[PDB]
Amino acid sequence: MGSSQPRKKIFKPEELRQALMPTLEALYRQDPESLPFRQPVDPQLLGIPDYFDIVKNPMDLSTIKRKLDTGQYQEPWQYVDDVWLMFNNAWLYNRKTSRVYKFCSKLAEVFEQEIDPVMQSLGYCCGRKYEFSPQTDTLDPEPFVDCKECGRKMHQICVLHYDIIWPSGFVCDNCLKKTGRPRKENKFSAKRLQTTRLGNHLEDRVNKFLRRQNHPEAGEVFVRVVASSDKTVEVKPGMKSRFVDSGEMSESFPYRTKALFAFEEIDGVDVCFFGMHVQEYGSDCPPPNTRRVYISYLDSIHFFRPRCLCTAVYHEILIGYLEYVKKLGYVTGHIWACPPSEGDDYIFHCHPPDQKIPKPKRLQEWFKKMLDKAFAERIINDYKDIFKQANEDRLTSAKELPYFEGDFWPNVLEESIKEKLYATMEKHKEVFFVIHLHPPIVDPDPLLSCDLMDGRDAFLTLARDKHWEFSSLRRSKWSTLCMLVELHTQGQDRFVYTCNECKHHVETRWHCTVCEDYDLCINCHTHKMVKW
Ligand SMILES: CC(C)(COP(=O)(O)OP(=O)(O)OC[C@H]1O[C@@H](n2cnc3c(N)ncnc32)[C@H](O)[C@@H]1OP(=O)(O)O)[C@@H](O)C(=O)NCCC(=O)NCCS
Ligand SMILES: [Zn+2]
Numbered sequence: 357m358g359s360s361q362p363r364k365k366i367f368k369p370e371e372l373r374q375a376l377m378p379t380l381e382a383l384y385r386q387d388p389e390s391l392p393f394r395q396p397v398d399p400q401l402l403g404i405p406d407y408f409d410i411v412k413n414p415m416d417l418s419t420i421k422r423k424l425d426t427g428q429y430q431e432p433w434q435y436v437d438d439v440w441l442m443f444n445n446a447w448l449y450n451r452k453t454s455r456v457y458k459f460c461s462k463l464a465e466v467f468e469q470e471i472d473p474v475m476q477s478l479g480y481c482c483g484r485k486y487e488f489s490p491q492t493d494t495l496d497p498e499p500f501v502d503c504k505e506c507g508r509k510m511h512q513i514c515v516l517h518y519d520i521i522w523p524s525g526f527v528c529d530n531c532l533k534k535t536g537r538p539r540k541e542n543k544f545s546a547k548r549l550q551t552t553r554l555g556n557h558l559e560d561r562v563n564k565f566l567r568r569q570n571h572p573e574a575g576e577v578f579v580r581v582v583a584s585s586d587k588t589v590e591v592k593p594g595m596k597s598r599f600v601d602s603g604e605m606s607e608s609f610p611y612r613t614k615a616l617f618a619f620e621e622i623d624g625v626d627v628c629f630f631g632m633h634v635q636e637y638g639s640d641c642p643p644p645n646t647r648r649v650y651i652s653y654l655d656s657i658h659f660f661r662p663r664c665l666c667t668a669v670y671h672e673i674l675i676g677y678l679e680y681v682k683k684l685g686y687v688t689g690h691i692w693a694c695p696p697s698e699g700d701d702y703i704f705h706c707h708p709p710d711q712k713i714p715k716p717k718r719l720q721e722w723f724k725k726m727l728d729k730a731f732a733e734r735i736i737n738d739y740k741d742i743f744k745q746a747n748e749d750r751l752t753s754a755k756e757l758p759y760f761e762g763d764f765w766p767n768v769l770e771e772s773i774k775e776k777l778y779a780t781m782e783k784h785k786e787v788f789f790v791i792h793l794h795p796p797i798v799d800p801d802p803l804l805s806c807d808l809m810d811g812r813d814a815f816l817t818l819a820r821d822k823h824w825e826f827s828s829l830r831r832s833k834w835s836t837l838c839m840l841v842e843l844h845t846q847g848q849d850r851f852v853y854t855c856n857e858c859k860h861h862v863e864t865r866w867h868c869t870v871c872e873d874y875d876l877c878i879n880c881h882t883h884k885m886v887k888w
């Protein structure tokens with residue numbers, strides 16, 4: 357196994373100890389919590405013959421101090437890997453309630469507190485030992501990268517490096533201004549996703565909502581429609597043999613589905629904090645589904661800054677969505693406000709351990725004050741739950757109720773043919789909403805084919821495989837980084853560009869610095885234009 361890197365950062369024993377040991381000391385100073393840790397665990401004093409079958413690499417403060425004093429640590433990470441072995445062996449063996457389990461956790465908050473600054477002035481990211489959350493005995497570790505010039509290993513996720521964005525390799529931040537060089541731009545930003553009129557309207561609406569509230573920690577929001585697709589929902593076999601064999605409802609029903617996410621700039625980087633999937637049923641779609649939209653799935657990560665503005669802006673996206681489709685020509689909208697089943701993640705792969713899933717009535721109340729704000733806003737002009745709507749509209753037939761993809765009702769009907777049914781309605785009135793908004797519908801936005809976002813399953817599976825967890829602010833940033841690379845670079849659309857005055861095909865063109873998608877010929881406008 358041949359190796360090389362020539363201007364390595366190597367640490368000689370006592371420069372390490374001069375930096376590292378103040379941290380060991382802070383552990384030792386913790387009294388009594390330190391005491392079961394100043395010595396190697398001795399199962400014959402303690403009375404635990406199982407120990408060495410359980411913890412197969414014992415570690416303790418004294419061993420660490422010996423390695424430090426004698427110089428057996430070449431790089432600081434070996435140091436910090438060794439104390440976390442100490443902690444991890446304790447949390448393993450001992451019961452979550454035992455005393456030394458508790459001792460241990462206190463040494464660890466102390467060590468976290470002390471280790472990060474020193475590892476940082478030694479030019480590393482943190483002093484932590486990170487493993488991804490358990491999958492379907494053992495856990496996967498966070499990735500590292502090596503500065504091409506230091507050689508000093510850093511958490512990939514900490515320093516947010518990805519070779520696709522910077523193919524020349526990773527180089528650290530201090531060596532970078534040693535280089536006189538700043539880091540090249542991450543072109544694969546939320547802002548730089550193709551923009552759409554739908555995405556713009558939601559984007560434009562909320563950020564000067566935020567402007568009106570004007571809290572200092574808030575950053576820019578970007579709303580992007582990352583997929584758009586023409587599908588049709590087939591009538592499930594029972595109801596179709598009973599109704600379209602008859603000729604009373606159509607076999608298929610066309611709809612356009614859109615997936616659209618919302619990003620905020622946090623610490624200088626895009627964080628994805630909201631995502632949604634709609635089904636839009638146009639004006640050519642036969643009854644019962646003509647001119648209506650349906651909010652399939654809605655999902656969220658709580659790292660929007662500030663949290664007090666957080667919920668309001670979710671509402672601003674939703675209400676802004678209905679505002680948009682209204683004017684296009686839609687007339688009614690439909691929310692199935694059903695809260696998650698089973699730690700079911702709707703769109704984002706590993707939610708924060710401490711962002712709790714709501715009970716259904718929380719979620720209904722939520723959606724209800726959602727709609728009240730828009731009613732007051734003169735956006736929606738009325739809304740009711742499904743029975744004040746259904747029996748107020750006098751419906752007696754199963755053909756009369758909108759029939760959506762993946763929706764509850766197609767499948768309550770579908771198995772109800774062998775076996776009563778207005779009652780199966782009456783139970784669940786509070787979970788389904790009917791939104792009254794009020795000349796063919798035509799969508800200005802082009803179709804975006806993105807297989808990763810066609811339906812919610814592709815993004816989730818890819819995230820499981822790539823460990824793009826949304827479970828911490830630092831992981832969401834990294835998961836957002838790579839989500840954005842997937843959208844930018846493995847979308848399915850090729851672009852043919854055309855001149856905005858003559859409609860002609862173009863290769864060379866003069867790109868406005870001004871308009872969001874504008875490109876004049878050479879056969880030539882008001883604005884400064886560059887050649888693209
Ligand atoms: C719907 C959603 C986007 C709205 O998020 P939100 O605006 O942050 O509000 P929530 O309904 O989560 O809860 C708001 C408050 O209630 C608390 N809370 C939420 N669920 C709770 C529960 N079941 N029990 C107790 N408290 C709860 C939260 O802590 C928060 O209060 P706080 O800041 O004082 O701590 C969010 O619930 C979400 O991401 N859901 C994912 C799955 C889901 O519910 N999908 C529904 C699609 S129809
Ligand atoms: Zn780190």
Ligand SMILES: [Zn+2]
Pocket residue numbers: 503504505506507527528529530531532
């Ligand atoms: Zn470096």
Ligand SMILES: [Zn+2]
Pocket residue numbers: 868869870871874883
């Ligand atoms: Zn212009």
Ligand SMILES: [Zn+2]
Pocket residue numbers: 855857858860876877878879880
């Ligand atoms: Zn021209």
